[PDB]
Symmetry: C3
Subunit: 224 residues, 3 copies
């Protein structure tokens, strides 16, 4: 009956709870970046735009690769407003209280695990969406699933440029972080499953690769 459990796991509604966890973890990472708090004070619109890149950079990149509107996902008003509320609470909540609650390690590890549920679903969705437009476009499927999983990391040089920072000596392709490299392995697996060369159901692959990402990220977050 594992396939019955895997089907329920792979079809949980990500909105709003799992998307909120994705936004919280991503905007927390933004606040850790150098000068981010000062930027929220002096350039609040640019700070909000930076948070939108961290929350929706996966869709911006995937739409750019497929020749669609790069801000197509911003028509989802409820998601944009939810990410905006997360950005406001993390940077401007009185007593910094919202930051204190979501940074509490037991709470943070749960949000970290929930973000990985969202990331794997976005990888698989990118492969399936590219396949719909290119039935045999294996390289387009792998590219779309990769940027859906890596997100803002692949545009880090220009997220820095928006913040007034320029560090051209490195980038996430020249030196992949773990989530970028893991998203590359994930998009190859989901493409192979789309090819019907990997004999596994799409629900089981989602379940087992999500558990791999959850264990890795929770372990990495709890260590440091």
């Amino acid at each position: 009956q594992l396939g019955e459990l895997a089907a329920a796991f792979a079809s949980v509604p990500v909105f709003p709870l799992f998307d909120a966890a994705y936004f919280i973890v991503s905007v927390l990472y933004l606040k850790y970046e150098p000068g981010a708090v000062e930027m929220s004070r002096k350039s609040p619109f640019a700070s909000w735009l930076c948070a939108m890149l961290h929350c929706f950079g996966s869709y911006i990149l995937a739409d750019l690769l497929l020749g669609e509107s790069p801000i197509h996902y911003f028509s989802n008003n409820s998601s944009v407003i939810l990410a905006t509320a997360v950005w406001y609470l993390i940077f401007f909540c009185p007593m910094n209280l919202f930051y204190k609650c979501v940074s509490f390690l037991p709470v943070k590890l749960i949000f970290v695990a929930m973000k990985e549920v969202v990331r794997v679903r976005k990888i698989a969705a990118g492969v399936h969406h590219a396949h719909h437009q290119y039935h045999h476009g294996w390289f387009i499927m792998m590219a779309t699933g990769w940027v859906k999983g890596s997100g803002v990391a692949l545009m880090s040089n220009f997220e820095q440029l928006l913040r007034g920072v320029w560090r051209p000596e490195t980038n996430e392709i020249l030196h992949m972080s773990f989530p970028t490299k893991a998203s590359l392995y994930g998009t190859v697996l989901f493409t192979l499953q789309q090819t019907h060369w990997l004999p596994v159901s799409e629900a089981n692959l989602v379940f087992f690769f999500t558990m791999f990402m959850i264990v890795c990220k929770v372990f990495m977050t709890a260590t440091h």
Copy 2:
């Protein structure tokens, strides 16, 4: 009968006279930039391309945001040729005579006011065009109207790169100039009017916001 006057004001044909004023003011600003005259001598094609960015950057950015051809507007041959003639006269007219005439302060203030007529129309057109593709895409409407009004300013980091200049410490989002910030207020107003939450006719909003931009820009130009 103000609405009858506002309807005539909001429907004046911008081509060719008001577009010419837009091109003249924008290419004048290009000639003020460092190394622009030297660039016209040594790299005339790059200088012409820079002037096309200043004249049509609003359409390039709006088409990029909506997933359309970024050079779609360059199919308008008469507009491209008119902007090309303006670029040639400003940089290469014998005796620098065309520059001397359009820089004469009474003449320049008139062209500055006429450019603001074009800018407000482009903001409203961007909101209406985005609304046609996304009936409830408020964030897409505001983004499209903003870049239609700000124009080349939002791509200033890469207009500089074309000229061989790189200044990453600042950008027009991190530090908005007045026209960029005013275009942001304008696109919010025209979006609200599109929402039917701002109880005002589209013609009256065009008239009153254009007069606001005309008074501000004419005052700013005459002061410095």
Copy 3:
């Protein structure tokens, strides 16, 4: 009977032999770039992506200009695999044997001539493709044919960024190399032929402009 010879010349199948020559010459140029060999060792995925830019940058740029998927051409699996095999053999063949064979000057000059056959065909195809979407879009036709011929050179600032290099003081528009400038003359000629203002058959223009590019590039390669 020259038109009968020109028709056969202009319709030779570029895949796979002429495309292979295009890939070999382009990836050879990549290996000449500073730090390219070290990059293939330490960042092999970024090295492979760099080679894809050199092999398919013409299609990436043309699709970007026309608002299509910038990786649309990567649905051609056989072409991507052939370019991938060329990249692997040039950087990783035991004894560096493949590099030694294709760098042998008589063999290299033949591949250089065959690449020019591909470049002229891509210029003409870009003009014809833009004309199909814009019957009177002369500036869109010239832009599309130019990037189809220049290829990765027009994105050199960002091919360098992928390699961790940033040299903003120059670019291929501000200072055109010979292939970039020759592709600009070529796209004007093919646009004029599309206008029916240049009284010459498309096959004869392909033949005579290819011979011009072959003689120039073979002479330039044999000199240095």
